[PDB]
Design a protein around this ligand. Sequence first.
Ligand code: NAG
Lengths: 213, 50
Amino acid sequence: SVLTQPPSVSGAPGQRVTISCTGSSSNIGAGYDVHWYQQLPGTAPKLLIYGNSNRPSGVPDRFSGSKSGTSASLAITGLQAEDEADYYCQSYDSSLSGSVFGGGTKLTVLGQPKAAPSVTLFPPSSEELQANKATLVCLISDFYPGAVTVAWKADSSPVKAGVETTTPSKQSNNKYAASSYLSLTPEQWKSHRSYSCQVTHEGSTVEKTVAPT
Amino acid sequence: FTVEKGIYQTSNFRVQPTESIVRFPNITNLCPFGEVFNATRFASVYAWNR
Ligand SMILES: *[C@@H]1O[C@H](CO)[C@@H](O)[C@H](O)[C@H]1NC(C)=O
């Protein structure tokens, strides 16, 4: 809205990373103090620094807050193993008659190497045919990272309806697994000759097909 | 001290203006500031709008 933030910022583990926050002349440039918060994906945000002059208890001294007139800046020294969150600007807005937050910056560069994926295609069982639906599942497991595109074909034309893709989650041995469903009906399931799922990972494309008859 | 008949040019006539107008525009622009007073609700005295 009234506060704009960059989408992402790049840095190195050992140099200085500085973020710039720009607003208006009635919320931050009027004279109001600014507050910075960290939005960890899964935990409630906490207070980092208020007023850019005092240090709250439990907060390290590596975080520095300054207000260069209409713009506020935050600087850090060294990238540790907990900076994988979002930084926001909080200031009182007279026009909005309340507190308004910023956009949010993501702090990550690269932590995902490559691996070799493996897929499995399982046709629906006999009890699924009488439910007036056909859920075609093509599971993908043991791959890294979790960025796989899913394409469905019926050996004559690609299927662009009912295609879904779930987000992958970390396995026990630091890998990723995913599944893809396809909503169909048993009326046309038997008419088609075969069904398959096609995926591509870093140029490696594998294909598995099943025959209902 | 003796002037004969004829035409004679003595000085020059200059019409000095008495008033000056220097107004360049007809009106100047404005900025949105009436919303400070024309508002649905106001703030309090411990935390007022700046
Ligand atoms: C506020 O609203 C009134 C009526 O809508 C209008 O006459 C006036 O010019 C506006 N601005 C101020 C500063 O009062």
